[PDB]
Design an enzyme around this catalytic site. Structure first.
Site, mmCIF file in Angstrom:
data_model
loop_
_atom_site.group_PDB
_atom_site.id
_atom_site.type_symbol
_atom_site.label_atom_id
_atom_site.label_comp_id
_atom_site.label_asym_id
_atom_site.label_seq_id
_atom_site.Cartn_x
_atom_site.Cartn_y
_atom_site.Cartn_z
ATOM 1 N N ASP C 14 -60.111 9.809 25.635
ATOM 2 C CA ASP C 14 -60.185 10.203 24.220
ATOM 3 C C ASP C 14 -59.510 9.225 23.256
ATOM 4 O O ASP C 14 -59.677 9.335 22.040
ATOM 5 C CB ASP C 14 -59.611 11.620 24.019
ATOM 6 C CG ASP C 14 -60.634 12.604 23.414
ATOM 7 O OD1 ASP C 14 -61.669 12.895 24.060
ATOM 8 O OD2 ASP C 14 -60.398 13.096 22.287
ATOM 9 N N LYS C 17 -61.543 4.149 24.075
ATOM 10 C CA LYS C 17 -62.030 2.978 24.793
ATOM 11 C C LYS C 17 -63.557 2.973 24.861
ATOM 12 O O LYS C 17 -64.169 1.907 24.850
ATOM 13 C CB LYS C 17 -61.445 2.942 26.203
ATOM 14 C CG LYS C 17 -61.725 4.196 27.003
ATOM 15 C CD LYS C 17 -60.994 4.209 28.330
ATOM 16 C CE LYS C 17 -60.895 5.624 28.833
ATOM 17 N NZ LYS C 17 -60.278 6.471 27.778
ATOM 18 N N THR C 18 -64.169 4.159 24.926
ATOM 19 C CA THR C 18 -65.632 4.271 24.987
ATOM 20 C C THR C 18 -66.303 3.845 23.676
ATOM 21 O O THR C 18 -67.322 3.158 23.696
ATOM 22 C CB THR C 18 -66.082 5.716 25.330
ATOM 23 O OG1 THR C 18 -65.820 5.994 26.713
ATOM 24 C CG2 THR C 18 -67.551 5.897 25.065
ATOM 25 N N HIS C 54 -61.109 7.695 33.619
ATOM 26 C CA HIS C 54 -60.856 9.091 33.932
ATOM 27 C C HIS C 54 -60.649 9.228 35.435
ATOM 28 O O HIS C 54 -61.341 8.576 36.221
ATOM 29 C CB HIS C 54 -62.055 9.936 33.485
ATOM 30 C CG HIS C 54 -61.833 11.414 33.581
ATOM 31 N ND1 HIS C 54 -60.796 12.054 32.936
ATOM 32 C CD2 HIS C 54 -62.522 12.379 34.235
ATOM 33 C CE1 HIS C 54 -60.856 13.349 33.191
ATOM 34 N NE2 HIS C 54 -61.894 13.573 33.977
HETATM 35 N N1 LIG Z 1 -58.870 8.655 14.383
HETATM 36 C C1 LIG Z 1 -59.810 7.959 15.027
HETATM 37 N N2 LIG Z 1 -60.567 8.564 15.949
HETATM 38 C C2 LIG Z 1 -61.475 7.881 16.665
HETATM 39 C C3 LIG Z 1 -61.667 6.516 16.466
HETATM 40 N N3 LIG Z 1 -62.491 6.112 17.437
HETATM 41 C C4 LIG Z 1 -62.772 7.156 18.220
HETATM 42 N N4 LIG Z 1 -62.181 8.246 17.754
HETATM 43 C C5 LIG Z 1 -62.299 9.608 18.346
HETATM 44 O O1 LIG Z 1 -61.521 9.701 19.559
HETATM 45 C C6 LIG Z 1 -62.166 10.635 20.448
HETATM 46 C C7 LIG Z 1 -62.573 9.931 21.745
HETATM 47 O O2 LIG Z 1 -63.399 8.796 21.484
HETATM 48 P P1 LIG Z 1 -64.089 8.079 22.749
HETATM 49 O O3 LIG Z 1 -64.632 6.781 22.291
HETATM 50 O O4 LIG Z 1 -65.026 9.070 23.326
HETATM 51 O O5 LIG Z 1 -62.822 7.831 23.719
HETATM 52 P P2 LIG Z 1 -62.932 7.666 25.319
HETATM 53 O O6 LIG Z 1 -62.421 8.959 25.833
HETATM 54 O O7 LIG Z 1 -62.047 6.500 25.541
HETATM 55 O O8 LIG Z 1 -64.358 7.391 25.607
HETATM 56 C C8 LIG Z 1 -63.423 11.102 19.713
HETATM 57 O O9 LIG Z 1 -63.162 12.203 18.838
HETATM 58 C C9 LIG Z 1 -63.715 9.868 18.868
HETATM 59 O O10 LIG Z 1 -64.718 10.123 17.879
HETATM 60 C C10 LIG Z 1 -60.896 5.837 15.521
HETATM 61 O O11 LIG Z 1 -61.063 4.663 15.142
HETATM 62 N N5 LIG Z 1 -59.952 6.577 14.804
#
Ligand SMILES: Nc1nc2c(ncn2[C@@H]2O[C@H](COP(=O)(O)OP(=O)(O)O)[C@@H](O)[C@H]2O)c(=O)[nH]1
Ligand SMILES: C/C=C\C=C\[C@@H]1O[C@](O)([C@H](CC)C(=O)NC/C=C/C=C(\C)[C@@H](OC)[C@@H](C)[C@@H]2O[C@H](/C=C/C=C/C=C(\C)C(=O)c3c(O)cc[nH]c3=O)[C@H](O)[C@@H]2O)[C@H](O)[C@H](O)C1(C)C
Ligand SMILES: [Mg+2]
Ligand SMILES: [Zn+2]
Lengths: 99, 83, 374, 208
Positions: C14, C17-18, C54
């Site tokens: 979250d 990174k994705t 994960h």
């Molecule tokens: N505050 C903020 N939230 C973001 C940003 N980028 C991603 N998020 C949010 O962080 C959460 C996880 O993003 P995701 O890319 O799916 O992270 P992953 O778990 O690494 O894949 C989601 O609610 C995204 O929309 C950012 O630049 N700033």
RNA sequence: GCUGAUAUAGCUCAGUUGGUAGAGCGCACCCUUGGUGAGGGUGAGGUCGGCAGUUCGAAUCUGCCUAUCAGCACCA
RNA sequence: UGGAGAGUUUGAUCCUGGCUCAGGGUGAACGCUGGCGGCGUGCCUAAGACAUGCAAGUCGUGCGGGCCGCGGGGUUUUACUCCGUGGUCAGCGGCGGACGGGUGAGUAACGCGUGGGUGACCUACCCGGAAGAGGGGGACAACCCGGGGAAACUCGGGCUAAUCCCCCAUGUGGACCCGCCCCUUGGGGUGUGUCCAAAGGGCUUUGCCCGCUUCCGGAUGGGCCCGCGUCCCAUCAGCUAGUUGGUGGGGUAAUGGCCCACCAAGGCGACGACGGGUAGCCGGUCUGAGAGGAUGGCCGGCCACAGGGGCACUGAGACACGGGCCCCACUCCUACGGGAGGCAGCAGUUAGGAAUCUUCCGCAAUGGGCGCAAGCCUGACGGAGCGACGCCGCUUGGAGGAAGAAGCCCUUCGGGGUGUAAACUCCUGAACCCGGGACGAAACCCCCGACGAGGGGACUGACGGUACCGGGGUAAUAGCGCCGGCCAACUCCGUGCCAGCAGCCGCGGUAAUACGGAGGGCGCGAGCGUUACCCGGAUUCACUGGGCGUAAAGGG
């Protein structure tokens, strides 16, 4: 996608008609022919059969009815006709048919 | 029309065509009419070409179309020559 | 043309990174014509592997670590230090991967003097804690989320016209620089582990994986050595990297290899495609291992001959019997040894090949083939 | 391929002395001279009245194993020797004689059968002009077998070619010993071929 | 490749309620036979699928992994 | 110019008789092992579904413009761009997509096979011959302008040329109504009447060249028809209304219920109708002494089908593999209004399965299309690749070399086998290295001579820098099956009706030639075993060539 053979199709719908007409002319001719050769229209009967023979053969001239195709229809037109100009007719206008 | 081509007899790399008469549309090595002579490319054996002249002519006197090289094997076979 | 380097992201879930991955590409399309993902700066070509980041998927994530020259620890402004982070970070040393560029994303979130620089403290402090450049690391700032929506408006934008747009170059500049390009000895035979397996109209079985040595092109004989039946010799008919044809595809480029006339069974993961004669199936083999001490995260007890953990060779994960040579018994942690392995599945070995020995969701030891018994 | 291996073991077994090694198989120890019995552990105890079969088996083997011809050819060549108009007795035997390599051996050049074969597989041999390397090449009437040139000066071609001075060739073969030629005047004859073989049996072995 | 389920003596299959693992069909040496059956004798054993950690105590709670069964994991 | 047998019912014998082995065949598969070449051959299942590529085009010597580059500027310049001339993009018009190629689904059928009939018929291009080719009107494309539209495309109007189209004469001639003649199912001739012909393109221009019209004769390939032959079930027995024939029409190239009206009631059937199963048929193929039996895959011949179902146009030819119209099932795009799609052509994916190929090189040959030719198109074809699938050819060495190493195994402890086998010594030299290096290819064409005969010349090779020749040169792969008998081949050990073998009889219950390993041995060799399936042996469905008093079987 396509092939230049459609060339051969359009080139068809055309002749496809060109002879269709020449066809239906001999039909509407023949009917309107015997149609009078049996009634007793000796003169104005052969008139048509003499007109038919013409329109029929020329059809032969083409890919339409060929060879016997008309040589056939004739030996029935002037065949059928005369076999009607006997219901009390006598081939007045000895146009096409012969005595 | 009716032509005078050849049929590929003989193994692989080992041709031995057969000079013959056949209704053009046939398949090369496909059923033909009557035989007229042979031909061996590698010219192995001083017996690598004959052609039933007499017969070869009949087929022409009635309209037979040779190939371009069939024309030739006949030319070597002196068929048109008449003196 | 421009030198190439396979990279990726890592970190806690979250964090982003994705999605950071989403920004990285896009942007790179404005000032670069014609544009796992692919983007290319005005200085280099690139391969990226968004990791599942994960637990559970780790098993194919580690295979993702083996497949990269650099890791991009993503971190959130509102968050910061995180469990999945501490984890997907020690695995960064295990599986090679030199240098690491942290990107404090979500940067645009709740202002604070400390935090912004207080987070770089929970980072840099946690980085050296694992013997890494924990002090000189390219920490960038500028939420990518926000920049990934600025490029969505109009699909064209040069050198940072929307603040964060240019803050995406803090990476597109900090990574080009800093993280060099290593060697991939092409003078060697051929070889390249298998990651997944695809199927296609007319083509068929394609192999994905990084090339380790030499190079391949259409018209090459190769061996598929990797468990089951026997090595399978086949010719390569397709060499395409990143959806497009690669001519000679060398070491350091994960292309799809089309093995002529085969099926999708005969070509499963953990295999290896090399020079006809390069590598062979071997079930028993010596190897000097390094039992990971208890303070290093591994075994806090030890074991005795007869034990049977799991070894991860290249992109595989198999189970073998440890037969300690007479006299070799309770060989505890933090100890280096020399025993033998007898994988329950024939595997591609080449004496002097690196591997590790894990067990139970933790790393237990580091080994390198010495000689092959069978 | 053509066996290759202990062959003075069959000098035994078939118990009808054999010389596939030439010189030695021809000495006071053709292996046969010391063991008139089959090999193995037993090899020297009472024998069950060999089956009507048996007999025919030894008879074939005896011959087929007396040339180097591995079944496939031999039995194949046998068949050819059937349709051929005439007694299968002669013919085949003759046909077995027609073997280029054999002939070589038949005509000095090499000490034993197994040798004549290498001579053909290396070039050393040559017929009516051009040379041949097919042990299978079958010889026809009035065809002379000649040693090549590159070989003529060979240590071996020597001694071997020497064993001729004095001895005469088979009554269907000639020999220009100095010019190593000799022709194939005609398919040998049953009697000419003094072989320890009962053809008529080997034949019977193939009806069943 | 991710989970889910099943893996308890040779075989069937019992159960527990965290702690000196059961039943019978079989089976091993006997006395007997020629050998076996039957008859009268004697019993002798479960790596709780596997490698491993937690406890005083590991078939029951933990973590991993292996054969197998089920799932819109899965076109360079 | 050609026939071979045995193991098994008994305490033993002979008889009938079933089973089974020795043989040969294979588009095979599975196992174990695997070096070479050439010639063969390679989905037998899903006639399942198919992301891509390529399979059929070619003519400027039929015609008119679009267009890019060059000749010379109409006049005097850009103006009414006229014309000399080669590429090029469709359009018109022509011959060609109805052969080649693929598959066997269907089909028991005049479908195939075969011998015939056609006085019941067709045939483009192809040669022979007879006569001709004189005048005439016009449209639509191309193109220009206007529109709907996501697109596939397409609607309006306006010019325009032809070998495109229609009318007159021309009637050598042919087609028709009718009459005569010879002939006999509509064939041949004859007289009146009626009716139809037609195009110019090229250069070296009262003459060639490819054409056009009609006529006829030849060739080639076809349609229809007929006697005969063409698998199992009779537990399938009766079947039929366009059904059987007639009559007059329609339709056809042509016979005929093929179709339709009218009448009459017939036609078929145990010589097997009607129905059910299966299946493309033959030439041929495997077997067999023969007669037979089994079979129909490489190649050829005929037929049938082209996603399923129906249909017509075009034409000499199809009711059309890669063309059209429609319905259906299903896939894809979609501006959700209507489009698109058929690899049983080549290469390949996947599904199923015991299982069957490369997204290929070349048009040089051969063959077919279009043209005057040049030459262009050609996944037919000629080659190559993979697969011991098959066959045939070849190597892993040849000659020496011990009363006889070592090791391994029996052992009446004396000594026997592996064994000249190895070692070792010569010799040869598969490979690998070196150079030269093929035929298949001589013609279209050009030149003398008339593009005649004939004579003369030149370009052209995918496989190939492979085959083959010359030089150099290293000893350099072996495996599987079997050993009680049928059947070639014996012993030790482990095992103790257990573990296990087994085609048949059968082996294993503390000495096993039969289980398992070993030593040894026998067959065969890049092969060798197993499975499957045809024939044989089987006179074991019997004609050749059997039987029926108790074996099987006489009908009460
Ligand atoms: N505050 C903020 N939230 C973001 C940003 N980028 C991603 N998020 C949010 O962080 C959460 C996880 O993003 P995701 O890319 O799916 O992270 P992953 O778990 O690494 O894949 C989601 O609610 C995204 O929309 C950012 O630049 N700033
Ligand atoms: C591990 C999975 C696959 C490995 C595959 C192969 O590894 C390799 O064979 C590799 C070759 C060396 C190999 O054998 N890797 C195998 C091994 C390699 C081990 C190397 C390097 C080390 O050195 C001793 C290195 C990490 C070392 O450790 C220290 C870390 C200590 C951490 C303690 C834990 C702490 C605080 C903690 O909170 C913690 C935790 O982390 C996990 C769980 N719960 C916890 O509570 C420090 O950071 C040092 O840097 C090759 O790379 C191959 O190519 C490969 C990638 C295919
Ligand atoms: Mg994609
Ligand atoms: Zn001897």
């Amino acid at each position: 996608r396509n092939l230049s053979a459609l060339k051969r199709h359009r080139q068809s719908l055309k002749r496809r008609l060109r002879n269709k007409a020449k066809k239906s002319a001999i039909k509407t001719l023949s009917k309107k022919a015997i149609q009078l050769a049996q009634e007793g229209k000796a003169e104005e009967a052969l008139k048509i059969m003499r007109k038919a023979e013409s329109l029929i053969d020329k059809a032969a001239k083409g890919s339409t009815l060929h060879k016997n195709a008309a040589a056939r229809r004739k030996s029935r037109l002037m065949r059928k006709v005369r076999q009607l100009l006997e219901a009390a007719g006598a081939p007045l206008i000895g146009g096409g048919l012969s005595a | 029309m009716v032509k005078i081509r050849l049929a590929r007899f003989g193994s692989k790399h080992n041709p031995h065509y057969r000079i013959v008469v056949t209704d053009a549309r046939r398949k090369r090595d496909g059923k033909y009419i009557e035989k007229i002579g042979y031909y061996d490319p590698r010219k192995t054996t001083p017996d690598w070409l004959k052609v039933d002249v007499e017969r070869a002519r009949y087929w022409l006197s009635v309209g037979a179309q040779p190939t371009d090289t069939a024309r030739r094997l006949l030319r070597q076979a002196g068929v048109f020559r008449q003196e | 043309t421009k030198p190439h380097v396979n990279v990726g992201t890592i970190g806690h879930v979250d964090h982003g990174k994705t999605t950071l991955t989403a920004a990285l590409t896009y942007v790179a399309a404005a000032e670069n014509p014609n544009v796992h993902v692919e983007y290319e700066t005005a200085k280099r070509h690139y391969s990226h592997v968004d990791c599942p980041g994960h637990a559970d998927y780790i098993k194919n994530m580690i295979t993702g670590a083996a497949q990269m020259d650099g890791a991009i620890l993503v971190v959130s402004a509102a968050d910061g230090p995180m469990p999945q982070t501490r984890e997907h970070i020690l695995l960064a040393r295990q599986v090679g991967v030199p240098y690491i560029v942290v990107f404090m994303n979500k940067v645009d979130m709740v202002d604070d003097p400390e935090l912004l620089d207080l987070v770089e403290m929970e980072v840099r402090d946690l980085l050296n804690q694992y013997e890494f450049p924990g002090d000189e690391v390219p920490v960038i700032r500028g939420s990518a989320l926000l920049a990934l929506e600025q490029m969505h408006r109009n699909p064209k934008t040069r050198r940072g016209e929307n603040e964060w747009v240019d803050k995406i170059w803090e990476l597109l500049d900090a990574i080009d620089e800093y993280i060099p390009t290593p060697v991939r000895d092409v003078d060697k035979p051929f070889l390249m582990p298998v990651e997944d397996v695809f199927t296609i109209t007319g083509r068929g079985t394609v192999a994905t994986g990084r090339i380790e040595r030499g190079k391949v092109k259409v018209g090459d004989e190769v061996e598929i050595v990797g468990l089951a039946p026997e090595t399978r010799r086949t010719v390569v008919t397709g060499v395409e990297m990143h959806r497009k044809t690669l001519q000679e595809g060398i070491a350091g480029d994960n292309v799809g290899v089309l093995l002529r006339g085969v099926s999708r069974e005969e070509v499963e993961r953990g295999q290896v495609l090399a020079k006809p004669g390069s590598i062979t199936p071997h079930t028993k083999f010596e190897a000097s291992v390094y039992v990971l001490k208890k303070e290093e995260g591994g075994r806090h007890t030890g074991f005795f001959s007869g034990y049977r953990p799991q070894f991860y060779f290249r992109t595989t994960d198999v189970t073998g019997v440890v037969q300690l040579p007479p006299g070799v018994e309770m060989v505890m942690p933090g100890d280096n040894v020399t025993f033998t392995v007898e994988l329950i599945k024939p595997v591609a070995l080449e004496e002097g090949l690196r591997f590790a020995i894990r067990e139970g969701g933790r790393t237990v030891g580091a080994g390198v083939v010495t000689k092959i018994l069978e | 391929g053509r066996y290759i291996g202990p062959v003075c073991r069959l000098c035994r077994r078939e118990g009808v002395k054999l010389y596939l090694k030439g010189e030695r198989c021809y000495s006071p120890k053709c292996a046969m001279e010391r063991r008139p019995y089959p090999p193995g552990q037993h090899g020297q105890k009472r024998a069950r009245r060999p089956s009507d079969y048996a007999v025919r088996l030894r008879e074939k083997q005896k011959l087929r194993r007396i040339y180097g011809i591995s079944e496939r050819q031999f039995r194949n060549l046998f068949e050819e020797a059937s349709k051929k108009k005439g007694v299968t007795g002669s013919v085949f035997l003759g046909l077995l004689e027609s073997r280029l390599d054999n002939v070589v051996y038949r005509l000095g050049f090499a000490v034993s059968r197994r040798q004549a074969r290498q001579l053909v597989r290396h070039g050393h041999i040559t017929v009516n002009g051009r040379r041949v390397d097919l042990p299978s090449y079958r010889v026809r009437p009035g065809d002379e077998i000649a040693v090549a040139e590159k070989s003529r000066n060979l240590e071996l071609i020597r001694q071997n070619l020497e064993a001729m001075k004095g001895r005469k060739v088979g009554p269907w073969l000639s020999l220009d010993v100095e010019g190593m030629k000799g022709k194939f005047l005609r398919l040998p004859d049953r009697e000419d071929l003094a072989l320890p073989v009962n053809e008529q049996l080997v034949i019977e072995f193939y009806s069943r």
